[PDB]
């Protein structure tokens, strides 16, 4: 049971909006909202959506092993190995928000400090004492991007798997020699870091030049989670305020995904009347190039909807019925909503893009939709007795750490999410710090009324206490 | 009673170093060391120190008066009005922390996510309705260092009052005629970010140029806290690791100050030796140039002890007894003293320049001096009723403005370094991200055993509670 | 009678290398190398050569007409409207070299100091005085790359005369209002500089991603010159030193446009056996991505000469026969053909990224093919009393503006690549500054013996005359 | 007989203003305005001049040792060996324009090209083959500006000589072991490029914080050349059109230089009424900041010149009598004195900073002060017969080395300004590219009348002869 399955089966549940039944189903971990900072939602007054892995979830694993599948292909096709085609994705082995390190090519799990939790070379994971010798601090410089790079969306799941999958074939196979920093084949070096650029620019290259859009679309069941309760929440929020889009993506896949997400024979209620997808929206803006988008951006042009391609010139227009935008700003969403920053409750599933830039730049707040938790709650509900356990450990060794991978192996092999063990991970840390609120899928909000106030407990220090 | 005052007045009881005698003394907040991290110190093989505000703790409100007068006096003499020679220190005014915007010449404190918790202009505090017409979010980007610079060290202290003085005198002096983002003079116009230029420039020049330094050392008992027990930590410290230095300050400077410091007719305990200070380091490095310190840093240098001046070349030689050493990196403490990031327990005032840097790009362990600490624990702790009606009146509108106020007067006009009422400080927040360890003096490392275990409590996301 | 024109029956004589013959020949302007500064050909050691318009010299009007109408279907297809299909290529109008202003939307004709020769609005030529209203000096800054763009390579064709086009379309169409910087069409403004940016844009695409490679390869005849005198020359610099290809172009193209230059049915002389275009070539290199090629360049790899696709991993091997490079730097040809720049004729078409970087940046010799030279040759001897008169007017007004435009005019609308009248253009002087040698074709130094001094003279200061 | 000394003579000769002898007396080289580029005289509405080295000559060597001496003094100061107190100031070594190779240690003359000329490794000059061994193209990269430094102002050269003293000193002093790229003492490195950058902030200390200015100011007869024809020339500018001051220095020190280049008992003629030297400029400005200046520049202020202080704020208003600038831009200039570019001829004395960006950022006419033409040109006249000879050797190998070495040794060790031998210097190239006129002195342009025409003739390309 991945965790799309889980999202699947509660889209697939009629909404019973009887305040009794609302109630109760919120109290389920898996329909909750979580909560970092205190929202009172009678104060937000727009509602803003990124579009891929948020509106349109894309089913796991069968989305990660397309693009996984084409990547490898296109690999292949600018002179890699044959052998690459025996790969075959495995959503066992990716957790996401691991940093590749280009210089020794492995991949680690690191805290919110650039401590190593998990160091795995190829398929090879790297014991305590065996990693001192290539990072003699067990720690690493996150901001040195030139050397690091942290694997934090969805859409890195593929490439996270393809590089444990390209050490693990060169380091063991016999025409290459395996050396510190890449692979000598007689003549010719391939270091870890060459090896990288070539996956990220394929990956770019199957998503902006390649097929995966055009698969995507050829049967958008396959690949994409349909919830009928998503017209009526996104209804919902336009009876007390405005609603927006802003996506990276273009207006003709937008368009096809959109229409799909809509595609039922009702509107927001069974029994309804059909609308088209456009009209739940007062904003709709594409090619938003976040996160650029929350600083000067790019200049705001207009989309001619019959052809799918920009009309000419900069748009220097209001807001009309029916435009749509591309480019712009973030300020181009608050002129045209006439909103202030925490007037906007933006909801997405870029722990950085969407939502870290949203609320530095801008100090929006913040929804951040994480696709996998629908699946780790269940992980970590089961499991409880590991944790507990390994809490007590703590409070009063070899115990410790046999704790720690029996618990973390529950998740895969790269353990959870959120933790190794007792110890959080850097995107946990993230989660806390820049989500406001966050779910395994926005719908949840559904189940809350128009003006609950979502509640934290307040910080102290350490002397205030 | 200053913060000083009573840091001077713990320095000058003796230490009782029975066991039970230390385990009761650290009970009490103020000789007590707060944990954000949990900390073992038996893993800690080196001690770190800078020495301004941290070996050196300057009295309060004496040396900022001083710096004030001697900033005041830089500015008549470039040709600020005759005026300036009537303003006076105040030391009720300043908090440490304050954001100057440069644009519209406010003094702002800020919450972690750039919140306006106070906004005065001059010594005018500015209303919530008010604010919003200069600050329409409540808000403000605190990385635009073009345009809003954050007083974050105690050095900064004169200049936060300085600038508030010069606000007020300019809006109510006949000549200028206010602006919205300066002060008009017929043909001149004075900007806010160009006056605050030229305060900047005035405070460095009255530390590097002027007399500042000069007037400290001629009357050192007047401006520098003195602690025989500060030899004696500092022994203990060396019997179980290594100790050094690491100032941005020069060598003749330090020579100074540290002389005072260690100036008693006795060794580490009474009736022992008097030892020289150099003594107590096995690594003594000046013109440190942190925050660049903690990445390439400089080229390193040896200082001629005999006269204060560097010797001519690179260093390259070994660590030496009795080397004082010039610039270099913080990978030059490494490699000198055989340490690993986390075997370093580094002790700073700067929670960026020494703490922020020193933990985020070389994973050192940290502890934060903060002097106002000393005082501040005293109002938290007598007037614990007002924080606690106000946690009661949150779980419960103007009452909780009226006791907000009236809790944050009892710290001084710009409230407590820590928050004001029950919202959190940028300051606060940063205290609790990057400082492991922290504690109004480092001296209260003396009441804790060899190899204490500092707690923290484990951080849970809130679907993990 | 175009330039190729020329080029081509020059192309067609076959090689009489008979000594007076030769010397003969090369007293005709067309078949003679220029001289800037003196380069004995004796002291050459290799002769290196870009591909395009060098060896591979595209046939006029052909092939900028087929660059011209495949941009225009481009920006057609890219939403511009569709009246831009009824364009067609006027070569009489761009002279390469000119400056588009994209703030004004003007071409420009400079001297080397910036100062305004010709200015055109579309099609409308400006006089003096009405262009002081937007240059005030009849000046431009020619380093301000974010304003004006230098239409410097043969390339540029094209694109010179479609921004003319664009702005008389625009200016007279009754759907835009013209603006100063730009067309209004209700709430879309198209700026010049973005209108720039499309069509830099769509050239770019059509020689990357569209089909004008394709277009070329399949009619080579129409296209491109041939010269059975390339492979003799070739040949023969073979035997006195080495020789090699640094080109920007694929290796896939390179392939085919060298095999048609080469396909004879015979060799270096008629009855020789026929050679590959590679055995001429000490060192072959493409995707040479010059001008950084000149300094840290890119890293160095092997083409797969079967495939055409680059082998995996950076080449760390030695020079050998067969191999074909791509990327690197100039230091890799220096290297693997033991030569310094001095010792080194470097002939391109680019006076910039071949020819200045080459020069300024590595020392070496230059050689710079300047195929228009081929027709402006014959405008500057049979209009010589033109000039000459024109020069009798200087040493003696509105007479002088008549003669220089009537002698302008013989060139083109927009003048000689090297004056307006008396004045010399930008690109006259670089030439001068950065081309050692020059000539229509570099074919003209089989004309010279193999030690041949190539002689100027020295110049003097004006004090030193 | 120093340059200075040929323009004192000239200088302490009284104006015979009749028009024969004008026209008599600019027949001679020494009292000549040569000519780069033609220039019409009434076309010129603004007379622009900088202060150092242009309005306030400084007397040779007497300047440049004082300079020497007191670089010398602040390096002993800072630490440097006792030694350098014995090095003395040779006016026979030093030629202006030399490169410092940091590399290598090396000061080096080029030709525009890059191409070595001349060698020196502290006093010994290195011969081409074993120049060969550290530059392998016998050539440099000038724009490398962090390893070459060019040393082309006229306080340059005290530097230029000690870089070689220092050089030679620590070659042949048996504490220091030679490397290639410095000097070892024991545990010490002294690169030379950090010997360079000790040496380059010396005499910036010197000039703005040292005594320099007090020692000159103090004896001015013996340090600045005086010329009675100065304010006879400056008001016939004024006459005819508009004159200003631009100068990178302090009020107070031009103040008292230009005090006294005014102090004679007569105003412009003799027996006039004295005027103030500031009634000679329609606008000064000081603390310029060129070549920032023809940039964006710094805000404009205003200077209080009763103090010499800068008043407070941006200065606003209108060009007002007896008002003085501080900072601002070249747009100051223009939009004050309603002038374009080519209406200004900018008299100045630094080929880059005053006359290379005013020419290539603004289109300013430009006059280069070259003050040892004044002796140069002596050189050049009696020693013609070396020159021809070697000019015929060139036509017509060991002969024509040995009379290149007779030549340069006639103008110094390190050979004339302009060339070596039959070669031009780099520094000879930028005069004739950047300097419309040049001459020994400005005060050259009194001897030509008011509409002069000063000619050049027209340049051919060698296929336009």
Redesign the interface.
């Known amino acids: 049971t991945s965790w799309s399955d889980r999202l699947q089966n509660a889209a697939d549940m009629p909404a019973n909006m009887d305040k009794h039944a609302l109630k109760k189903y919120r109290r389920e971990?898996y329909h909750?909202v979580?909560?970092?900072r205190s929202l009172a939602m009678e104060k937000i007054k727009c509602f803003g959506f990124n579009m891929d892995y948020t509106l349109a979830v894309y089913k796991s694993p069968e989305y990660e092993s397309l693009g996984f599948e084409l990547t490898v292909e296109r690999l292949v096709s600018?002179?890699?190995?044959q052998e690459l085609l025996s790969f075959a994705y495995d959503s066992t082995f990716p957790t996401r928000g691991l940093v590749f390190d280009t210089l020794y090519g492995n991949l680690l799990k690191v805290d919110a400090?650039?401590?190593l939790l998990v160091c795995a070379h190829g398929f090879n994971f790297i014991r305590g004492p065996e990693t001192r010798e290539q990072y003699?601090?067990?720690?690493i410089?996150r901001?040195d991007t030139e050397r690091f790079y942290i694997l934090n969306t969805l859409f890195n799941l593929p490439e996270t798997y393809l590089l444990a999958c390209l050490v693990d074939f060169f380091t063991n196979c016999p025409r290459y020699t395996s050396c510190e920093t890449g692979?000598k084949?007689?003549?010719?070096?391939?270091?870890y870091r060459?090896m990288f650029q070539d996956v990220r620019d394929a990956v770019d290259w199957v998503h902006y030049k390649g097929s995966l859009k055009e698969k995507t679309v050829e049967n958008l069941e396959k690949y994409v989670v349909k919830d009928g309760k998503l017209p009526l929440l996104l209804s919902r929020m336009k009876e007390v305020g405005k609603v927006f889009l802003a996506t990276n993506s273009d207006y003709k896949y937008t368009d096809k995904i959109m229409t799909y997400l809509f595609d039922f024979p009702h509107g927001p209620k069974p029994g309804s009347s059909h609308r088209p997808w456009q009209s739940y929206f007062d904003l709709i803006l594409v090619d938003a190039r976040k996160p650029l988008f929350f600083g000067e951006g790019t200049?705001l042009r207009?989309v001619?909807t019959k052809?799918g391609?920009?009309?000419?010139?900069?748009?220097?227009?209001p807001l009309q019925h029916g435009i749509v935008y591309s480019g712009g700003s973030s300020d181009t969403i608050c002129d045209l909503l006439g909103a202030?920053?925490?007037d906007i409750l933006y909801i997405g599933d870029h722990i950085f893009g969407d939502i870290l830039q949203s609320?530095?730049?801008?100090?929006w707040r913040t929804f951040l939709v994480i696709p996998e938790?629908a699946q780790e709650?269940h992980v970590?509900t089961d499991k409880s007795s590991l944790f507990e356990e390994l809490?007590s450990l703590?409070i009063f060794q070899r115990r410790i750490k046999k704790v720690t991978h029996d618990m973390d192996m529950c998740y895969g092999m790269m353990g959870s999410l959120?933790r190794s063990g007792?110890r959080?991970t850097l995107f946990?840390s993230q989660?806390?710090r820049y989500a406001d609120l966050?779910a395994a899928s926005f719908i949840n909000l559904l189940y809350y009324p128009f003006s609950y106030l979502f509640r934290?407990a307040?910080?102290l220090?350490?002397?205030?206490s």
């Open positions: 971990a909750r979580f909560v970092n600018i002179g890699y190995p400090y650039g401590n003699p601090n067990k720690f410089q901001d692979f084949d007689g003549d010719l070096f391939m270091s060459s200049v207009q001619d052809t391609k920009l009309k000419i010139g900069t748009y220097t227009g202030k920053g925490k609320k530095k730049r801008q100090g938790l709650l970590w809490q703590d959120f007792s959080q946990a989660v806390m966050y934290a307040h910080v220090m350490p002397h205030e």
